[PDB]
């Protein structure tokens, strides 16, 4: 998932190395960054970002600080 997504002045972008970054669209200043592993896809919805990796581990993070809300890995 390499096309950047923009919601409310904030850019969410995924690097190949599983780095997920939230930036201010105007300045490019990083609001938050999470170092993850093997993230294949993500989506922004309401107050959360939902991610999954190749291991079918699914996470939710806050849209504000990229803070982990929950993790599901027993799929």
């Amino acid at each position: 998932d390499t096309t950047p997504v923009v919601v409310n002045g904030v850019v969410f972008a995924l690097a190949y190395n599983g780095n997920l970054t939230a930036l201010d669209l105007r300045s490019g200043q990083i609001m938050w960054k999470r170092e993850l592993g093997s993230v294949n896809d993500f989506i922004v919805d309401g107050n959360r970002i939902y991610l999954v990796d190749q291991n079918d581990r699914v996470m939710a993070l806050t849209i504000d600080g990229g803070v982990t809300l929950w993790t599901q890995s027993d799929l």
Binding site: N40, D41, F42, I43, D45, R48, Y50, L51, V52, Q54, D56, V58, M59, A60, W70, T71, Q72, L75
Partner: protein, 74 residues
């Protein structure tokens, strides 16, 4: 893979020909359905249905509430 969100559910398809609905609140499994083949596209949600296109060339629609297969084509 692929992940989508609708109606209090996170939907995800897997290579293992499984589709999961987790609750957006806590990530607990709402439901789990075996599909006709490798689910290698984002699930697409519309009118209470979760559409799954498989590598198998099948197209299935699963009920949003319980995950039951409503129809299968191709």
């Amino acid at each position: 893979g692929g992940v989508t969100v609708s109606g209090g559910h996170v939907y995800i398809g897997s290579e293992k020909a499984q589709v999961y609905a987790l609750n957006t609140s806590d990530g607990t499994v709402a439901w789990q359905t075996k599909v006709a083949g490798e689910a290698l596209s984002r699930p697409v949600v519309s009118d209470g249905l979760v559409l799954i296109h498989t590598s198998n060339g099948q197209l299935q629609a699963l009920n949003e509430a319980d995950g039951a297969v409503k129809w299968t084509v191709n």
